[model samples]
Target: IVGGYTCGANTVPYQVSLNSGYHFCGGSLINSQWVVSAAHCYKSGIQVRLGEDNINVVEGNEQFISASKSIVHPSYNSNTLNNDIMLIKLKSAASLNSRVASISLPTSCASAGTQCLISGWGNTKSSGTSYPDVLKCLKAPILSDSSCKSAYPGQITSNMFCAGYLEGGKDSCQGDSGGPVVCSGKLQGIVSWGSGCAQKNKPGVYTKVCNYVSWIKQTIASN
Candidate 1:
């Protein structure tokens, strides 16, 4: 298992784990108050481990926060995979410290060549094996709306943005969904979908964080 390493050229702040053993591509904290990940991670026993080096995760600033509630975007439908985003509310607000406090969320987030980083235990290569303990990360520049729209024959909606190495080869794969895509040290994107991992004409797709500001604020307010 690789630990405390840099991916591409940046350091990733997240960790991956399983409810029992092994890991899936899950996200880490945006701040102590927020844990953003993919809606699919809500499957019975998938888990997210933060501030730990390996799967055992018995120590570190990390904590196990069961999703007291799972809030998927109201319009999300698994069959069509629409609005595939969700929030995991910790039982209580996490104590803030450099290792556990809130990380900044983006203000001018967008899909226009904004370089971002995505980290997870997903396949190192498309259709490959997921990393067991070491987290793997990649660097991507957000693609413009028009470029992303034209890349997919399937529907591309306003709520999603494209991110990946633009030279047609580099991306987050199938199990990588829900992990944060960081840019400028802020939480900016969430892995969502794409034709494939950095395919010739395809870039990885993500949920645009900026578009859901109201929904996020409102949901958190109710708590």
Candidate 2:
């Protein structure tokens, strides 16, 4: 995460690391068996680690599980980055504990200027060279789609939204993809994409989770 620092080990219990023996993306445990992430982050040989803080060391509370199935949104468009969300089904239900829990899903859309928290193990800087061993978190304000479009005209859509400082120096970076954008204890967005890490007028883009509630529910039930 850009312009962020190490958060407490148990601050975000729902946070998870998507790995194929190595960290690649972040995700949130929405339930015991379901994890929601970005479709663009999808790849083969993926597994998930929950209740973890440090990526390099083993913890007593950590739970590792193989991904039995992964489902990308049917209308996901890579070129335009529309509907960049997905769901990962764990091989077994995660056991709830002090260090493991699920985040609540948003019941309504977040309003502009709502303060939110984003957490991940993504790059600490724009060069994308250094990754934190522990999870990092930062606070940002949500921007309206109209305001977001000003930065990336003809690109921002209803399925996407933006958050961060327009002045730069504080936004999610490359490795933070598929992470959570939580507001008021509810998941509002998933870190989807961005131009460059913390560039001028370039806020981080996220997939609007509120818009896909029905899809997420139906997919999980069907699967």
Candidate 3:
């Protein structure tokens, strides 16, 4: 979250940290027992920490739940970084509280030019390493598919979209992947990949979550 501000405690109630001892990735609590993250963050032994304000501070509202199982999108391509979405089933449902809750998925796909909110515990530096203790957020506009594709030729698939600035210095960084890219109070995209952290002409790319809402609902219902 380069050039972003620290969000207040419980400001992002639905955010979760994919952690063992430290934050590795970010996730969204979509339901009581389910979370959505990037497939690249998938690991058999994952602990989803919800209601986390500061990674270094002990907050009573936090819940550390193990992942019982997870499913990566079948179309996910590591080489192209498309369809980079994953769903994890928690070992137990999180007790929803004032500091822990679920976020609604987008009802429809986000359009280009939509101003969105992206929250995460990703790296705070555009270069080198510096992860924030508290979660951060950046307000970035969604770039059209065509414009995004232009930024990263032959890399931006329809399943992926871009956000952040072309001028750089303000975008999600490493470790932010799998976090929420929200638009109008709905989960819209998942932080997937990009050329580098907050670089000129290279905005942060995300998995198009809106295109998979049906798959997500069905996967949860059938499980």
RMSD of 3: 0.9
lDDT of 1 by residue, 158-203 (tens): 7788877556657877656777778887778888877757567778
| Stronger candidate by TM-score (1 vs 2) | 2
**RMSD to true structure for each model, in Å:** 3.5, 0.9, 0.9
CA lDDT of each prediction against the hidden true structure: 0.64, 0.92, 0.91
Candidate that would win on lDDT: 2
Model 1 bad stretches (over 4 Å): 1-11, 14-22, 44-48, 56-61, 130-132
Q: How far in Å is the alpha carbon of 52 misplaced in model 2?
A: 1.0
lDDT-best of 1 and 2: 2
- Model 3 agreement with the true structure over 109-153: per-residue lDDT tens digits: 989899988999989998789878999999999998888989999
Q: What is the Cα-based TM-score of model 3?
A: 0.98
- Per-residue error at 111 for model 1, in Å? 4.5
> How big is the positional error of residue 7 in model 3, measured in Å on the Cα after superposition?
0.7
Clashes of each: 4, 0, 0
Collision count of model 2:
0
List the lowest-lDDT window of 10 residues for candidate 2: 123-132
